[PDB]
Design a protein around this ligand. Structure first.
Ligand code: CAC
Ligand code: CAC
Ligand code: CAC
Ligand code: ZN
Ligand code: ZN
Ligand code: ZN
Ligand code: ZN
Lengths: 406, 406
């Protein structure tokens, strides 16, 4: 364990945040993971950082503040937290966020108090959100095996230690830690993901044809679409990885081009429900029927009660042989569950899925063919029996996936 | 363990810091003690606190910073740190500091980086140092059984876990946590301690005569001197305990009235040395001869190589039967070891040991008889054999200690 956890640490500061000499790093991490934090701080200074600032998190104590503090302490952000953000901004600090996800960490908390805080914080920390969204500084989101998440992922474990050990093992396996040189393994894997995206971006397929057991579906793609995966580059030219781990290569379909049907292959976790065996039927871009062996009404309510929820906003590729795909585990954490399999999203497209989408207007994205909606629900459809062809503007079929792989 | 830890948390927020409705509490505590941290934060809020700010500490990570960060990051205090301090002052926040001892935590660090930081910190945090020293806000220093400290206190324990268990057992014992109502137990004990100080202040003895094995000493007391113990009161009139635990009742001797000899009765930890069997020889106020069974050279340089070090600044009384006294253990922590026995201190007197001495100049204190030195070193001299008389004006003998108790 101590050996693997130190390899994890090194992987996060080299491929995740790419610490260089001179750098300031802000690490956001649970007090429960103090051992991983010691290692991250040690590896960060060894790559030359001049300062690592640890912003320690604790679910029990933050829940206390939310229960008891008066609204006046929640909707006013104290000046010292803005000064802290300004220090980080001025030193171009990288943001490494290592999260363990317990979903009922805020049980009993009033939604209005949470919302008041999220609003006041959302405004006061906007300079930090702009810097990270626009990639001015490097940032990575990763995971750590906290007790309450681990009990949720492995509710049948023999004990709490076991639940925790099984979750660490998943994290090490899916982040390539058991490899002899994880740093190298991720450099190589990142270049492969980026060459898939680059290949599909040079193709500019007109449509995608998927066939599998319970699936036959043609989805058209928007003109000037962008496939994204893997890493980014920050404002100083440094290569970084926003997510550890990561597999998918995704774009937006044209929301007014869809015919056929598709069945889900992996449990979907949505609003506290586990939904199984979904089958979606499309005609003219639109969902005309949706069913599930489990959570039927939830799925209907989703599509036939939310604006924009009768169309797709995302199509994503992931080899079936890849590590999350091969786990068979529901993690209830998007970082992992949305890298599990080929998938499609009900609802909103990401703006960056078309060229210059970041600048376009709401009316303009619609024009470009990107779905707008307030919901966005990714559901897995891939398996070792899925085939996919890209369809060129002149109907020529180019094989992309056979039996669930490139 | 969990039931005792919860009782300990309650005692810290009730008798230690005395949280009242509407208060702000800052708790400084190691990430290693997150479980005690959860409990203190829950009880402070249950008593009506409007905000608990937890300033988490971590020795490993702080040492990394001192070992690897440039001087520029260490000799300066960032503005956000000063802003945080001001938010606490503005909110009259109480300061609960829960510490585990490790003087060896900053091993390998450049001495130069150490004093530059300490001097910057001391200038920058001055407003908070003056607020706490004058008891404007409540503050308490207490202990938590950290692994590193536990290994130092119990070097013979069979495992890390047994060392910490042993140290927690000492903390709980001495802090009266095993009692049914620790909160009630400290109210009584603090009143007892306070009545002792009150009683000794009423008598204004002229001197004390100590007799025990290896010990014959008369100490002159200063005119209008003040015995101190236990609780204080903050500027809002709220009562609080600055130290948990505490037992000693102390004042300063007139640095110029002493003759005789005294021998220490408990190991002394001074500058990383363990010092045993000390015999100190006084005449007309001055130290004329100090010898020691172990560390004889250290004790010689102490007194003869430091300005002021040839006279006493403190005489304290602790009942031989009290918990730390009986434990027999060297804690390597002043909070504990300085409450272990009757003792004397070589060097500096506390200003508060004469009436209004807090309002006096260094010139003023010395004229009043209070030693001034850059050094202050307590050594234990109590046992169950010790007899102490308060010598009145007319020279009437009053018995204060018989056989090491009142
Ligand atoms: C985490 As995603 C790009 O599949 O919504
Ligand atoms: C902790 As003391 C008053 O004996 O210096
Ligand atoms: C630790 As002391 C001030 O009693 O020498
Ligand atoms: Zn996706
Ligand atoms: Zn998605
Ligand atoms: Zn003392
Ligand atoms: Zn002292």
């Amino acid at each position: 364990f101590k050996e693997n956890l130190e390899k994890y640490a090194k992987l996060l500061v080299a491929n995740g945040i790419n610490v260089q000499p001179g750098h300031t790093l802000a690490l956001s991490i649970d007090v429960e993971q103090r051992e991983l934090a010691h290692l991250i701080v040690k590896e960060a200074y060894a790559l030359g950082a001049h300062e690592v600032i640890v912003q320690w998190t604790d679910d029990v104590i933050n829940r206390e503040k939310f229960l008891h503090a008066p609204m006046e302490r929640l909707d006013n952000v104290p000046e010292y937290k803005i000064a802290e953000m300004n220090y980080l901004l001025e030193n171009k600090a990288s943001r490494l966020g290592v999260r363990s996800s317990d979903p009922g960490a805020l049980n009993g908390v009033d939604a209005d108090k949470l919302s008041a805080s999220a609003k006041a914080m959302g405004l006061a920390m906007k300079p930090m959100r702009i810097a990270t969204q626009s990639n001015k500084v490097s940032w990575t989101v990763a995971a750590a095996a906290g007790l309450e998440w681990a009990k949720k992922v492995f509710p049948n474990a023999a004990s709490d230690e076991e639940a925790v050990d099984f979750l660490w093992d998943q994290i090490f396996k899916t982040c390539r830690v058991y490899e002899a040189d994880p740093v190298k393994a991720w450099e190589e894997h990142a270049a492969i993901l980026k060459s898939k995206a680059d290949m599909l971006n040079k193709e500019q397929f007109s449509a995608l044809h998927y066939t599998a057991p319970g699936t036959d579906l043609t989805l058209g793609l928007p003109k000037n679409h962008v496939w994204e995966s893997a890493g980014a580059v920050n404002a100083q030219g440094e290569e970084f990885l926003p997510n550890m781990p990561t597999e998918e290569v995704f774009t937006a379909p044209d929301f007014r081009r869809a015919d056929g049907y598709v069945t889900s292959t992996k449990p979907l976790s949505y609003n506290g429900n586990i939904i199984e065996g979904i089958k979606v039927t499309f005609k003219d871009g639109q969902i005309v029927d949706i069913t599930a062996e489990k959570g039927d009404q939830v799925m209907k309510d989703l599509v036939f009660e939310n604006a924009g929820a009768r169309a797709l906003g995302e199509c994503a590729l992931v080899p079936d042989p890849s590590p999350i795909s091969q786990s068979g585990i529901t993690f209830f954490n998007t970082l992992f569950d949305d890298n599990a399999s080929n998938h499609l999203a009900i609802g909103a497209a990401y703006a960056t899925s078309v060229v210059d989408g970041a600048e376009m207007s709401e009316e303009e994205l619609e024009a470009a063919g990107l779905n707008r909606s307030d919901v966005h629900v990714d559901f897995m459809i891939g398996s070792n029996q899925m085939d996919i062809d890209g369809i060129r503007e002149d109907g020529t079929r180019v094989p992309l996936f056979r039996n669930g792989n490139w």
